[PDB]
């Protein structure tokens, strides 16, 4: 067969150790989920890092920098995101993984909800990808491996993520990925039905109004790996409806510089037939982790953050924001409480 005796025994033991790690991780998650912080004047507001509202760099007045997310309650209501948003705070307080951004404080006032997270200073993968143009296959693989491990973790907790895209992946000071934005994350032991996500990254079963499951995240991983290695996504067009036509068609074309191993992996991730899509089969995530394109990946070394990253962003000190774009800076909290009943639990 493909593996000799030593190799097969090593892989077997590695897979059983993953099961052991995940069982403990699910126990910690459920304990925190069952039994889950500050105020606006505790922080000096510095500048706006990104755009329901804005994310701002703040300095806690222990001197540490954080990214403070500000959500207008009326906006959350108008976009019908009330349950998605209360759930995002609950998920972020309860999970724990090296590639998931860490929530440190939460609170609210008359008009806004606030989530204070660790500041990830290296900027969005999106910016780096558009600037460099495309990532080499080893560079794309280093990032992909972190997403594989992160989805393996989240899916073991029965959480579907549903918003993978380079815009939602931050690069930290060591060049590793931080997943942000859990507004669409949900516990789904079986199926769920909400039409949500980003057009380029939607699995066909979402577009076709089906009940769907965590397999949509593995489709989205295929889209991400393709966009990282090509510089552009596998399905695009002027308007979303034409993008959906390409996604459901069952056809994908690849750049001539893609390796044969990469094309084979992507044809198995970007698989319209759910009975054939990697991540959705009897062997689960092992079909992905054991694929030839990942043969050089040391999964435990990635998890321990012992692999040298291909890209280390510029860090000129604490509070440096040079990796983020510039946005217009605004100041206001209403004298009356907005949407009090809808957000009582936040």
């Amino acid at each position: 067969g493909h593996m000799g005796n030593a190799a097969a025994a090593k892989k077997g033991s590695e897979q059983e150790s993953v099961k052991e790690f995940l069982a403990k991780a699910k126990e910690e998650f459920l304990k925190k989920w069952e039994s889950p912080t500050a105020q606006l004047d505790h922080f000096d507001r510095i500048k706006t890092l990104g755009t329901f509202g804005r994310v701002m760099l703040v300095k806690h007045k222990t001197g540490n920098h954080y990214a403070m997310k500000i959500l207008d309650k009326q906006k959350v209501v108008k976009l019908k995101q009330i349950e998605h948003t209360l759930n995002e705070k609950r998920i972020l307080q309860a999970v724990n993984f090296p590639f998931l951004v860490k929530l440190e404080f939460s609170f609210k006032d008359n008009s806004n909800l606030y989530m204070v997270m660790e500041y990830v200073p290296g900027g969005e993968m999106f910016s780096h990808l558009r600037r460099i143009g495309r990532f080499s296959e080893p560079h794309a693989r280093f990032y992909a491996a972190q997403i594989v491990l992160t989805f393996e973790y989240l899916h073991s907790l029965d959480l579907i993520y549903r918003d993978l895209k380079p815009e939602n992946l931050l690069i930290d000071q060591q060049g590793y990925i931080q997943v942000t934005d859990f507004g669409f994350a949900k516990r789904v032991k079986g199926r769920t039905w909400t039409l949500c996500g980003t057009p380029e990254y939607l699995a066909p079963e979402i577009i076709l109004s089906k009940g769907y499951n965590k397999a949509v995240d593995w489709w989205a991983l295929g889209v991400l790996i393709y966009e990282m290695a090509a510089g552009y996504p596998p399905f695009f067009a002027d308007q979303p409806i034409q993008i959906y036509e390409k996604i459901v068609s069952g056809k994908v074309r690849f750049p001539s510089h893609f390796s044969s191993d990469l094309k084979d992996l992507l044809r198995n991730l970007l698989q319209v037939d759910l009975t054939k899509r990697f991540g959705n089969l009897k062997n689960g995530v092992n079909d992905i982790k054991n694929h030839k394109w990942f043969a050089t990946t040391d999964w435990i070394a990635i998890y321990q953050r012992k692999v040298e990253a291909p890209f280390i962003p510029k860090f000129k000190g604490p509070g440096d924001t040079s990796n983020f774009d510039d946005y217009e800076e605004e100041e206001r909290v209403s004298i009356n409480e907005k949407c009090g009943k809808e957000f009582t639990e936040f």
């Binding site: 976009l79 995101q81 558009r130 996500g197 980003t198 552009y232 695009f236 002027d238």
Partner: peptide, 20 residues
């Protein structure tokens, strides 16, 4: 090229989620 078609699409910037 496919890259030129990507530029022509107008969807090269940060992309919004559906609910926007």
């Amino acid at each position: 090229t496919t890259y030129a078609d990507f530029i022509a699409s107008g969807r090269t910037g940060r992309r919004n989620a559906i609910h926007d």
